Amino acid sequence: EMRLSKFFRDFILQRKK
């Protein structure tokens, strides 16, 4: 799994409020 990790880099990082 070397793909869809960039989707998760944009999604998880918006929950670091």
Swiss-Prot record:
Q: What subcellular compartments does it reside in?
A: Secreted
Q: Which GO terms describe its biological process?
A: establishment of competence for transformation
Where the protein is mainly located, per its record? secreted
Key word Secreted present = yes
One annotated GO molecular function is: pheromone activity
Keywords of the record, alphabetical order, are: Competence, Pheromone, Secreted
- Which is one Gene Ontology cellular component term of this protein? extracellular region
Function statement: Acts as a pheromone, induces cells to develop competence for genetic transformation.
Homology family: Belongs to the ComC family.
Question: Know the name of this protein?
Answer: Competence-stimulating peptide type 1
Give the originating organism.
Streptococcus pneumoniae
User: In the record, what lineage is assigned to the organism producing the protein?
Assistant: Bacteria, Bacillati, Bacillota, Bacilli, Lactobacillales
- Name of encoding gene: comC1
- The range of the complete sequence contained here reads 25 to 41 of 41
